[PDB]
Coordinates of C-alpha atoms and ligand atoms in Angstrom, one line a residue:
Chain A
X6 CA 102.3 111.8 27.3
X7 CA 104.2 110.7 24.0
X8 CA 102.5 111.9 20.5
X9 CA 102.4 109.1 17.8
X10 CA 104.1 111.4 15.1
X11 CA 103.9 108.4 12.5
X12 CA 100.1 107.6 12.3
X13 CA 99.6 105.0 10.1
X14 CA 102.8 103.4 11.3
X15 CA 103.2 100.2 12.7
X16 CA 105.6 99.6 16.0
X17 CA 107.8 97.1 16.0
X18 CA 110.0 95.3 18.7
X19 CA 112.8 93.6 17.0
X20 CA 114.4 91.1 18.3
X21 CA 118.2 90.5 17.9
X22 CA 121.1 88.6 19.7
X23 CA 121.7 91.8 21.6
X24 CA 118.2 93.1 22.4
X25 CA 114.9 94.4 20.9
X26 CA 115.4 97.3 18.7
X27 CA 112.0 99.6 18.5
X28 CA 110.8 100.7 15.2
X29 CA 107.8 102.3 13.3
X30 CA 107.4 100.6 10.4
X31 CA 105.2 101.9 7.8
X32 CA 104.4 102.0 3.7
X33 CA 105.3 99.0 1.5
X34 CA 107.8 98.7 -1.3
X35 CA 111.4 98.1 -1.0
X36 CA 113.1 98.3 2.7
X37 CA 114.2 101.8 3.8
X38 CA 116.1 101.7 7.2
X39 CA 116.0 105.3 8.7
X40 CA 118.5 105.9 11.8
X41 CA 118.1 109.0 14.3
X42 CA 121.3 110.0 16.1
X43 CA 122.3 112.0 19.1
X44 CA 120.5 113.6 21.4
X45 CA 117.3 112.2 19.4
X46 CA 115.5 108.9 18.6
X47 CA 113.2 107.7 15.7
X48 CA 111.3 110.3 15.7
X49 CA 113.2 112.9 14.5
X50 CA 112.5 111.6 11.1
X51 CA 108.8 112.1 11.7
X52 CA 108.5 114.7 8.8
X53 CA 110.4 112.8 6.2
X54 CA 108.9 109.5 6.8
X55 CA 105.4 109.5 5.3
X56 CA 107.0 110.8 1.9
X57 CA 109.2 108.1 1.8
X58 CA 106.5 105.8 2.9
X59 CA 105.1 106.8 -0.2
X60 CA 107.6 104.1 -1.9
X61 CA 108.9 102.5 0.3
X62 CA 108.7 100.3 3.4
X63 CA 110.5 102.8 5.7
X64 CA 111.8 101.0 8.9
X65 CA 112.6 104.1 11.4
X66 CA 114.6 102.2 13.7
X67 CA 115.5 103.3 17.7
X68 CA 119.3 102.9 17.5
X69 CA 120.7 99.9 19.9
X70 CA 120.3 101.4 23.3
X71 CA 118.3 104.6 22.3
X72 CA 114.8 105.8 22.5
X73 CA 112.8 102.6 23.4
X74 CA 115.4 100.2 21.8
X75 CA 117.2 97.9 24.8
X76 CA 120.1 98.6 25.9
X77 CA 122.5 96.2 25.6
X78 CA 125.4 96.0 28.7
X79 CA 128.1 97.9 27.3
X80 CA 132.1 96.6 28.4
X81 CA 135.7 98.4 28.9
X82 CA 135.4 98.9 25.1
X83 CA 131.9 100.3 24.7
X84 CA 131.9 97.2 22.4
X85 CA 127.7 97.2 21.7
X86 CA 127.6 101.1 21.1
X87 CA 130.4 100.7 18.8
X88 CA 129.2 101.6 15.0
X89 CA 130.2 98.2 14.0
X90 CA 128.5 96.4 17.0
X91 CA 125.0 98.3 16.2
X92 CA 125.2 97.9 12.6
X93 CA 125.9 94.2 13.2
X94 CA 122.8 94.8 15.1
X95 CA 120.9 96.6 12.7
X96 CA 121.5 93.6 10.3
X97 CA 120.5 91.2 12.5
X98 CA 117.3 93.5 13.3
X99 CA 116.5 93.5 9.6
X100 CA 116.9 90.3 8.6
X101 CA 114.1 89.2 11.6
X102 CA 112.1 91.1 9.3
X103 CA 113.1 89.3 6.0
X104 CA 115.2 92.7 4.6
X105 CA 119.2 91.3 3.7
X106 CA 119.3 93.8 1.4
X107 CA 117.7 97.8 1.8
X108 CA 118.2 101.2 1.5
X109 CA 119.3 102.7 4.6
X110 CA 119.4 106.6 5.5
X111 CA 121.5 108.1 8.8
X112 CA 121.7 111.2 10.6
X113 CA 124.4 111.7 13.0
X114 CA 125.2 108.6 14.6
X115 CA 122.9 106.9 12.9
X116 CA 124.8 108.0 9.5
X117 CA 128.0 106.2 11.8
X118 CA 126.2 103.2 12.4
X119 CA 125.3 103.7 8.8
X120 CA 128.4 104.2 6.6
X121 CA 130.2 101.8 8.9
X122 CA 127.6 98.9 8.1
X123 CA 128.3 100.1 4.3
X124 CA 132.0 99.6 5.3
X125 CA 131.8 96.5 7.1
X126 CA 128.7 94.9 4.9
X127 CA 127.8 96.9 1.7
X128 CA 126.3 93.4 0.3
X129 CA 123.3 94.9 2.8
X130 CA 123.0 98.1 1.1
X131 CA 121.5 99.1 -2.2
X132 CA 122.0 102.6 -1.7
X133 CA 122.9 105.1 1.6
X134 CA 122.0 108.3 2.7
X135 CA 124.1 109.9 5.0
X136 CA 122.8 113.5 6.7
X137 CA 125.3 116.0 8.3
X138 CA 128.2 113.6 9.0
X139 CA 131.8 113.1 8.2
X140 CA 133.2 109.6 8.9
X141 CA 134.4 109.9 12.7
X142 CA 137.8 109.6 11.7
X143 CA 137.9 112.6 9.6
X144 CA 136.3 114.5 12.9
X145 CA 138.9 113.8 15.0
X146 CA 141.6 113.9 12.3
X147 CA 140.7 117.5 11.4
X148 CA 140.7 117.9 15.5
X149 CA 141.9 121.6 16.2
X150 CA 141.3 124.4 18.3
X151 CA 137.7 124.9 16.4
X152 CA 136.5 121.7 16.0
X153 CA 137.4 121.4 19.8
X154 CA 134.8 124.0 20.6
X155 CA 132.1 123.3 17.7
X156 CA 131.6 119.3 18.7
X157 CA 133.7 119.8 22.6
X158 CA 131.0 117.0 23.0
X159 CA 132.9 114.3 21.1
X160 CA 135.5 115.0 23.7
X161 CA 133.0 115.2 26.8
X162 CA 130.9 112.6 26.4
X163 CA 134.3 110.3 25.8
X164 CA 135.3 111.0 29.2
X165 CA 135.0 108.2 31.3
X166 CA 132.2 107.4 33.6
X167 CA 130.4 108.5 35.5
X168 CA 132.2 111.7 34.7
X169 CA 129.4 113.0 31.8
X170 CA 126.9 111.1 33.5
X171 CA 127.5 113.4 36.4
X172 CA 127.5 116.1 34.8
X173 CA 124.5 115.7 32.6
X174 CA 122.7 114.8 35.4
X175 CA 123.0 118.2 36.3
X176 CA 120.7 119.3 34.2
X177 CA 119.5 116.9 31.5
X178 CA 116.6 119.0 30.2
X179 CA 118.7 122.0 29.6
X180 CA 121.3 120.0 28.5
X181 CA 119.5 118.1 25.2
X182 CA 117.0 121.2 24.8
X183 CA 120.3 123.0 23.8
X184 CA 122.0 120.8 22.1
X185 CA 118.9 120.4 20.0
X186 CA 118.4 124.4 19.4
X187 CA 122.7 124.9 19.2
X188 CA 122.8 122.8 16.1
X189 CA 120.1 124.4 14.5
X190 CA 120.1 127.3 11.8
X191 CA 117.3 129.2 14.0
X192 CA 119.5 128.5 17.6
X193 CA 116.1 127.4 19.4
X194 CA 113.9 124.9 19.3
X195 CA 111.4 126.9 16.6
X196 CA 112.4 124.4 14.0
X197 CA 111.3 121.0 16.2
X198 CA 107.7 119.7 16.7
X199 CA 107.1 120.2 20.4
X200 CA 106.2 116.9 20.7
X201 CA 109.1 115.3 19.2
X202 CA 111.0 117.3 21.7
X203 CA 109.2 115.9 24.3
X204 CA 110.2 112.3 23.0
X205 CA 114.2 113.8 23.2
X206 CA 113.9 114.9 26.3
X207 CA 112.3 111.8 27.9
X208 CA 114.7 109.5 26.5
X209 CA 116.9 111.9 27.9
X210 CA 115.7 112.1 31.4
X211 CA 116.6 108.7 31.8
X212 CA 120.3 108.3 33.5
X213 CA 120.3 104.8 31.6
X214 CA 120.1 106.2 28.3
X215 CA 122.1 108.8 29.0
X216 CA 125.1 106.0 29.9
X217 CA 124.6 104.4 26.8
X218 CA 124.9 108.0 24.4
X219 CA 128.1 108.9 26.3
X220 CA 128.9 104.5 25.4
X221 CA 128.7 105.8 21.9
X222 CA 130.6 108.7 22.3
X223 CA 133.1 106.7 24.2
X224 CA 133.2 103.8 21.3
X225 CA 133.1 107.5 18.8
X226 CA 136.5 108.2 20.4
X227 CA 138.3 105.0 20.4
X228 CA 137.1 102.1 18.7
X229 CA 134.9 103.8 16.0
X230 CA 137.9 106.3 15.2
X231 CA 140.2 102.8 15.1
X232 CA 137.8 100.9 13.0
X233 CA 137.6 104.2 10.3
X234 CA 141.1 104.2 10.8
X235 CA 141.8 100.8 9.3
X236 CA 139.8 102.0 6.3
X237 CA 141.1 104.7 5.7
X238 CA 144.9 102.8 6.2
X239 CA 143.2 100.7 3.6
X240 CA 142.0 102.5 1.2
X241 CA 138.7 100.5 1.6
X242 CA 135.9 103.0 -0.2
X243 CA 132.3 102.4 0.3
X244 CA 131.2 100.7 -2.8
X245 CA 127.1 101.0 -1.7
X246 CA 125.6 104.5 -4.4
X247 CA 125.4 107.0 -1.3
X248 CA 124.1 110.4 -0.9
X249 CA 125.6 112.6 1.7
X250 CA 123.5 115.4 2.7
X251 CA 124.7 118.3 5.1
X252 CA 122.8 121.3 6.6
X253 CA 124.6 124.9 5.0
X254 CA 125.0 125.6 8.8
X255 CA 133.3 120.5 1.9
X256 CA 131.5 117.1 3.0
X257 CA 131.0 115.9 -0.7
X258 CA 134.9 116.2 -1.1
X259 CA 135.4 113.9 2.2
X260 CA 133.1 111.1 1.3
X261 CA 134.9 111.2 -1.9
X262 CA 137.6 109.8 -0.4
X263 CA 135.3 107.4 1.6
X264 CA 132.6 106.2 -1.3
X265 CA 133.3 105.8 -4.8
X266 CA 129.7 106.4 -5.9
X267 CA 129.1 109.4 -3.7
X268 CA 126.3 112.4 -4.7
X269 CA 125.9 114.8 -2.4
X270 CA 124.1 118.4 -2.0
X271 CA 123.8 121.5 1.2
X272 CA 120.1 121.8 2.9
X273 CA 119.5 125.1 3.6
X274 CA 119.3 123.6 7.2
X275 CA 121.4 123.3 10.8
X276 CA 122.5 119.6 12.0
X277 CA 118.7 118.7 11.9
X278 CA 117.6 118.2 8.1
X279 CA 114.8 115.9 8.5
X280 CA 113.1 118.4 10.8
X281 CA 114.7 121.7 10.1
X282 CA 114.0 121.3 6.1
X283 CA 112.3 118.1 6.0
X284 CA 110.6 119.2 2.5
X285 CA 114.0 119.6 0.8
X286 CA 115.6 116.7 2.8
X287 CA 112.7 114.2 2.3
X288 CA 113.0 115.7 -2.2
X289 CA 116.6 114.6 -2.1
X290 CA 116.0 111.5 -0.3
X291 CA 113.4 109.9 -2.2
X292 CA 115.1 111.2 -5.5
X293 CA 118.0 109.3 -4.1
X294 CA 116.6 106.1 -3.3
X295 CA 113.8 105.9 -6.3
Chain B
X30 CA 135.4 126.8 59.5
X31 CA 138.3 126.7 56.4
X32 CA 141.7 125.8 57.7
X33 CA 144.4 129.2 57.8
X34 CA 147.0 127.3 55.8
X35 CA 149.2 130.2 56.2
X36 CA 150.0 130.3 59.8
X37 CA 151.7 133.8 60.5
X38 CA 151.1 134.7 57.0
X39 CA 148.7 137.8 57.3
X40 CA 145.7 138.7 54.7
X41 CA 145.9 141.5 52.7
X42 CA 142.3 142.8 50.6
X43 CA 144.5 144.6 48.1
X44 CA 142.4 147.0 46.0
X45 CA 142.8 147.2 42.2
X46 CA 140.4 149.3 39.7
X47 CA 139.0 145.8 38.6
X48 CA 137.6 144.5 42.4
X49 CA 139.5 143.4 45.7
X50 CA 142.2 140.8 45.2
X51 CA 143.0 138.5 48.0
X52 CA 146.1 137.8 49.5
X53 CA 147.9 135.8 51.6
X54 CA 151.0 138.0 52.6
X55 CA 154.2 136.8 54.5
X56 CA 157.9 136.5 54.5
X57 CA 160.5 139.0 53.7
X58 CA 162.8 140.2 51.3
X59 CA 162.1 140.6 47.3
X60 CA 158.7 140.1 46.7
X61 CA 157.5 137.4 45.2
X62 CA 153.9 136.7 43.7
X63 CA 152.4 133.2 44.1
X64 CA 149.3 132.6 41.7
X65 CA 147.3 129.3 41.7
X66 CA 145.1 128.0 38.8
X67 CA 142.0 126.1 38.5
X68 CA 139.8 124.8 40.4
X69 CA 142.1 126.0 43.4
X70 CA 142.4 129.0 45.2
X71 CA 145.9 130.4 46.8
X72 CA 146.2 128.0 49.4
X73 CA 147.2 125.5 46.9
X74 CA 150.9 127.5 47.7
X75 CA 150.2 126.4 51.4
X76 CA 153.1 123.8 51.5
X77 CA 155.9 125.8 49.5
X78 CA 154.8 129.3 50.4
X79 CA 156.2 129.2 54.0
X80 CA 159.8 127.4 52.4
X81 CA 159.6 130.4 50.0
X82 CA 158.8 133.1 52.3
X83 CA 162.1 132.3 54.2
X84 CA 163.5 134.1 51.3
X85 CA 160.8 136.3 50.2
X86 CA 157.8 138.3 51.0
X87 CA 156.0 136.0 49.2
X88 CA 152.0 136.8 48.0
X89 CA 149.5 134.4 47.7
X90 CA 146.9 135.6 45.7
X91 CA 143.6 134.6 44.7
X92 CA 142.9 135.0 41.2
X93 CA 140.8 137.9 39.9
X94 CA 137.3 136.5 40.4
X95 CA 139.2 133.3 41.7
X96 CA 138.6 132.1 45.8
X97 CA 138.0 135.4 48.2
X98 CA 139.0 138.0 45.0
X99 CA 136.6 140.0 44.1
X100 CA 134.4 138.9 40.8
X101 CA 134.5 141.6 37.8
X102 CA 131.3 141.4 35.7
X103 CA 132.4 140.1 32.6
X104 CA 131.5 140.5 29.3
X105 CA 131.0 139.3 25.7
X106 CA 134.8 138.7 25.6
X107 CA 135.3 137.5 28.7
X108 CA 137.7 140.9 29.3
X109 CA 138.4 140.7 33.0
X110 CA 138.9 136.9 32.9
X111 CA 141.7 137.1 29.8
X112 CA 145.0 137.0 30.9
X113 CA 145.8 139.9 30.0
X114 CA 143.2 141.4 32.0
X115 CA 144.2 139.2 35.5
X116 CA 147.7 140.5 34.8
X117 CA 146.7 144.2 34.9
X118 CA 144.8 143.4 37.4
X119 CA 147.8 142.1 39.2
X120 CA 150.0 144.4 38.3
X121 CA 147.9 146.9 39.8
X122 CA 147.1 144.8 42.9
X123 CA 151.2 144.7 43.3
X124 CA 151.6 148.2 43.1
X125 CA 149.1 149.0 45.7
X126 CA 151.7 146.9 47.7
X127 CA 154.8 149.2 46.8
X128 CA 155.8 146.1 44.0
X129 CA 156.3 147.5 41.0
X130 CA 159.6 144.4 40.0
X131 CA 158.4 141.2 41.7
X132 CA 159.1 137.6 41.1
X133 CA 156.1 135.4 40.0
X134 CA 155.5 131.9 40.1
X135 CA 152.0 130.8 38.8
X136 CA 150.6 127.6 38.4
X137 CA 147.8 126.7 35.6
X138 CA 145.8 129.2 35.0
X139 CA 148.0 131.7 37.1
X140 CA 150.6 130.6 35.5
X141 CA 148.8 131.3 31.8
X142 CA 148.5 134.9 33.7
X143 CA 152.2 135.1 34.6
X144 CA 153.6 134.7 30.6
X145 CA 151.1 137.0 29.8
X146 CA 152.1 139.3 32.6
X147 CA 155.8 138.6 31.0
X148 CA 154.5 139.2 27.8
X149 CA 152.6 142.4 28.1
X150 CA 154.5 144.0 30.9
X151 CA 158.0 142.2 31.3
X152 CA 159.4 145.3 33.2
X153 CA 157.1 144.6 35.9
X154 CA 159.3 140.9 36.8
X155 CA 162.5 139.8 37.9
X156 CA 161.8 136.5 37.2
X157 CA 159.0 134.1 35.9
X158 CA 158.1 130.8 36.9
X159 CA 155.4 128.7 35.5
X160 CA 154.4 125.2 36.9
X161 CA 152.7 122.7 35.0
X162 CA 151.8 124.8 32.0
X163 CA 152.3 125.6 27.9
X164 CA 151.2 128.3 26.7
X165 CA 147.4 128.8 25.8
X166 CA 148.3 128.7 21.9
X167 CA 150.6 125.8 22.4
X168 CA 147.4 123.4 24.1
X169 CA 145.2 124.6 21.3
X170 CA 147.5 124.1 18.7
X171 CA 148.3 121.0 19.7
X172 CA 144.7 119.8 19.8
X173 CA 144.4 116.3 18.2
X174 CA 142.1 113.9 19.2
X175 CA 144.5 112.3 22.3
X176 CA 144.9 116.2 23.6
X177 CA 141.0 117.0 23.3
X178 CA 140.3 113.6 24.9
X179 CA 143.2 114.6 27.8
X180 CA 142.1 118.0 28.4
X181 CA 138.2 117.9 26.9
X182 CA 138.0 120.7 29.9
X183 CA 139.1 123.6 27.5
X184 CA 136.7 122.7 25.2
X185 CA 133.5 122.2 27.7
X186 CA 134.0 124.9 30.0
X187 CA 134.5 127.2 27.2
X188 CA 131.1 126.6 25.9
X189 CA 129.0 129.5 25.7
X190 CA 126.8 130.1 28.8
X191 CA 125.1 129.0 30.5
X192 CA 125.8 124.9 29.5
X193 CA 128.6 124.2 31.5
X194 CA 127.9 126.3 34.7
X195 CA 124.5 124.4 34.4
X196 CA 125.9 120.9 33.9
X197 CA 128.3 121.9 36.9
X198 CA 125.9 123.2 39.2
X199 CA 123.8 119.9 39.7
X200 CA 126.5 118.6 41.9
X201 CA 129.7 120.5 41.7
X202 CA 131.4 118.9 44.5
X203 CA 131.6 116.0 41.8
X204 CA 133.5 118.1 39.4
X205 CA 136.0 120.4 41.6
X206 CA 136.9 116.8 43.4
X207 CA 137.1 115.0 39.7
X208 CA 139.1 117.5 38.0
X209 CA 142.1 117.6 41.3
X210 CA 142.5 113.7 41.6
X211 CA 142.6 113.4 38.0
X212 CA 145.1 115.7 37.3
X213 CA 147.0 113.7 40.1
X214 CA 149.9 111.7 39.7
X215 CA 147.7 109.0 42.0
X216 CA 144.7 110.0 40.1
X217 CA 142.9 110.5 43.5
X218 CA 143.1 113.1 46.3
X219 CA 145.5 111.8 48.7
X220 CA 147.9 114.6 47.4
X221 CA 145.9 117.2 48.8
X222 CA 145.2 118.6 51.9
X223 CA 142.1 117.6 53.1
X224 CA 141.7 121.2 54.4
X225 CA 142.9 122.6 51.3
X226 CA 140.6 120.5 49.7
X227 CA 137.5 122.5 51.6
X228 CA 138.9 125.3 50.0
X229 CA 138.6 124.7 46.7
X230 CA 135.4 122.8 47.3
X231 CA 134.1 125.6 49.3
X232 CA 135.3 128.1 46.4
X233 CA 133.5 125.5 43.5
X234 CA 130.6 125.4 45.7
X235 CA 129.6 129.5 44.6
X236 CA 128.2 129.2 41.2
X237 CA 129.3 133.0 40.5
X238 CA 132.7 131.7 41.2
X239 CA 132.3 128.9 38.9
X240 CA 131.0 131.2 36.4
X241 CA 134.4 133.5 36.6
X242 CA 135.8 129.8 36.6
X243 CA 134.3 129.1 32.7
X244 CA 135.1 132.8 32.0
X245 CA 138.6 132.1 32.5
X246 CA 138.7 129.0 30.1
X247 CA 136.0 131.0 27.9
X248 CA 138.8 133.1 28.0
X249 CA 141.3 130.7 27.7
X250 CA 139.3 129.6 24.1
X251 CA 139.0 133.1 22.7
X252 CA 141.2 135.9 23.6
X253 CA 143.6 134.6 25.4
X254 CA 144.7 132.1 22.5
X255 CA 144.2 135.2 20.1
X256 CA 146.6 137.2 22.5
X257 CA 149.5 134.4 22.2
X258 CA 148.6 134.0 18.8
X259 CA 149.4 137.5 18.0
X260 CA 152.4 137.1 19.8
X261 CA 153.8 133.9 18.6
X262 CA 152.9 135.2 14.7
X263 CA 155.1 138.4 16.0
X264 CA 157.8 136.1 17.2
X265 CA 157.3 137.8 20.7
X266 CA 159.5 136.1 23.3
X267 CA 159.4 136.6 27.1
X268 CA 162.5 138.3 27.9
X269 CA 161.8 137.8 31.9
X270 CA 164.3 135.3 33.3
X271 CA 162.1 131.8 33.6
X272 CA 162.0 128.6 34.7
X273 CA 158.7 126.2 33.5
X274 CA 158.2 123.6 35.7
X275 CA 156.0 120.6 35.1
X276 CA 154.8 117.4 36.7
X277 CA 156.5 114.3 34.9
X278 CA 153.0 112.9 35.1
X279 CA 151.1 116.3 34.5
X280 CA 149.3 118.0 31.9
X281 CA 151.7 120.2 30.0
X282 CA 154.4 117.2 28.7
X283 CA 150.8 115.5 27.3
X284 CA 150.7 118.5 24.7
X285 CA 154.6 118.3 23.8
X286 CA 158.2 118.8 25.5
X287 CA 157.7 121.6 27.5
X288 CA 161.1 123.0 27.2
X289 CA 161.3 123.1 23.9
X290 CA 157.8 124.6 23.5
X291 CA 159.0 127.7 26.1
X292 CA 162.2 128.1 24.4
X293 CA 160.0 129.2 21.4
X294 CA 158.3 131.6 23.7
X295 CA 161.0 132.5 26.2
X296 CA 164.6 133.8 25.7
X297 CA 166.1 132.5 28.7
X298 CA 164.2 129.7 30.4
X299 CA 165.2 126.9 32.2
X300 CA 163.1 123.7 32.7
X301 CA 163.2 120.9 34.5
X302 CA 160.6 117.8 35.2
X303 CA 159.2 117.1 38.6
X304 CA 157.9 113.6 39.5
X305 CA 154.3 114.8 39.9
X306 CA 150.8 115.4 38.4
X307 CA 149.7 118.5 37.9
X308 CA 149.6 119.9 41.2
X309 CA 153.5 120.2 41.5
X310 CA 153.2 122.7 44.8
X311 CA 150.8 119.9 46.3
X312 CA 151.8 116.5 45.3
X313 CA 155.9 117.6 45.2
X314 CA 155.9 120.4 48.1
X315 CA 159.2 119.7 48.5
X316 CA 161.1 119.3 45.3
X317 CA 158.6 122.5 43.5
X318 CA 159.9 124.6 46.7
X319 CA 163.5 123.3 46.0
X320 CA 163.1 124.5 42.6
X321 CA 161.4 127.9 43.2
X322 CA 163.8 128.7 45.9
X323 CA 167.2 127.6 43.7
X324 CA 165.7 129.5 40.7
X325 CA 164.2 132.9 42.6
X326 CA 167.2 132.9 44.6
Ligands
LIG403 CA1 119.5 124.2 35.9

């Protein structure tokens, strides 16, 4: 039993060269692309969404082989979980639906996919919004003994298989339950609507899907970190306006180094801004974007 | 039905203020203290114990809370699973015996227990031998992103109860088998004994024992780094005789060159590679008993 938490929403299967992508798809106005990350899908941006589809046509997109997106066969290199592979994805989801050129807004690994398509493709972009990320290189350059503990994930899901497939399997419930209330300011579930959880934990009940997160963690630890890495070597900024947006519980400084139009301001929030503060993180993001 | 991998070695329940520790006891002359690491139990000495206790009255021990040792309650801090705490512990367990100036030889997480045995308490040793180890501080401050990858285990098994006993207890055979032919030279189990194996499956298959088990690297991520930071800030140096040991293919030379990291911890130590994983007393019986012997001799 799965809530429709976007009423008024369309749902969209998008086709693309490497599988549907699912999205809601409501309001009109210019293109707004809104990407979930981990342990979530879509949904989680089920409080922020109608205010933005106040003015715009906001797109909230399943990332490539979460929620009820396909999953596309992953390789040795966890190629299509890859940030580069799913925005290349993303693109080609957007342009089925006419929109070369929109606003796009990520949290977590969607913020990945998100500044890496600005990276790879900012010709796509008019503006980004980036929520509670540094660029994946900066996590695993600043990699120390407290970082370790904080996101041990990054490290755990990157083992190979079928070691955190195992062990999730374990107990999958607990397992995204607390990773949903760790990485918020409350530290349980209080801040989430129940039946959004219920969407996380069904995606996550499903071994398949569970591959494919530990795929992205997997291409988080080697070719994502690689690709940010020859940017960085580079010096190649994001030229795309961004915000970056980060729950209180120095991120503009980073994407400073990363963006060279970059705004940026704390949510009195955990990891989860669209649903901890989704008043203050919806303000900021249609401020942004308008 | 586990396997005695100690035959003529007797058992000894030795009783300490902080719960029973086990022992395999035999051999004699000095006294020697065997103590195994994670996810193993004593017998992991099986195939260099009896070499050794030609020489010595060797003791195997099960770690505090470790294999047929009694579990201490722990706490907020972990306490009885700190190193510091499992050396008292053994201290006290070796005085029960009458062995107040032993030799030690620890392995993983008995060897972390052993340097901080030397560090707390160096009157209590003759000599220290670690196998397959740095010190705690050393793997976290050596943390980048290829060390976090290599030993992501320090991270996940530290995190707060009850994740990882919950992630481990949905098929924990998986995990004890995973973690001792990764660490492998081979990278599968043919190193082992298959009835040593049973031990530490046996031991993995108690989820309080795999509790004490994330206590210890719960541990290892809190105190026992804060311990060895204090010490390494204080320039604190194990004045114990020592010899660090470590698998050409195992964990510690993934961190750094082990001798030079002991030298910064260790006044006189002595090192030398052995063509092994991790499991030096397991996949290179031989060549770790060679070694123990020449050195405790
Ligand atoms: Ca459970």
């Amino acid at each position: 039993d799965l809530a429709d938490l976007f009423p008024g929403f369309g749902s969209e299967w998008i086709n693309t060269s490497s599988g549907r992508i699912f999205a809601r798809v409501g309001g009109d106005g210019p293109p707004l692309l809104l990407l979930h990350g981990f342990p979530q899908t879509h949904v989680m941006w089920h409080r922020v969404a109608p205010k933005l589809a106040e003015r715009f046509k906001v797109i909230v997109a399943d990332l490539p082989g979460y929620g009820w997106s396909d999953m596309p066969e992953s390789d040795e290199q966890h190629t299509p979980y890859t940030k580069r592979a799913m925005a290349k994805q993303l693109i080609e989801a957007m342009e089925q639906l006419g929109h070369v050129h929109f606003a796009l807004a990520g949290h977590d690994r969607g913020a990945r996919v998100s500044y890496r398509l600005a990276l790879d493709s900012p010709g796509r972009l008019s503006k980004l919004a980036v929520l509670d990320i540094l660029p994946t290189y900066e996590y695993w350059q600043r990699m120390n003994r407290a970082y370790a503990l904080k996101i041990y994930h990054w490290s755990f899901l990157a083992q190979p298989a079928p070691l955190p497939e195992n062990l999730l399997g374990g107990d999958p419930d607990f397992y995204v339950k607390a990773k949903l209330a760790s990485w918020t300011r409350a530290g349980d579930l209080s801040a989430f609507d129940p039946r959004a959880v219920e969407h996380y934990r069904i995606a996550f009940a499903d071994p398949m899907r569970r591959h494919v997160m530990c795929e992205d963690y997997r291409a988080g630890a080697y070719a994502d970190f690689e690709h940010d890495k020859i940017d960085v070597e580079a010096g190649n900024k994001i030229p795309v306006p961004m915000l970056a947006l980060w729950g209180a519980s120095t991120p503009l400084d980073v994407w400073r180094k990363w963006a060279s139009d970059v705004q940026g301001a704390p949510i009195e929030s955990g990891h989860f801004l669209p649903e901890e503060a989704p008043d203050q993180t919806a303000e900021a993001l249609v401020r942004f974007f308008s």
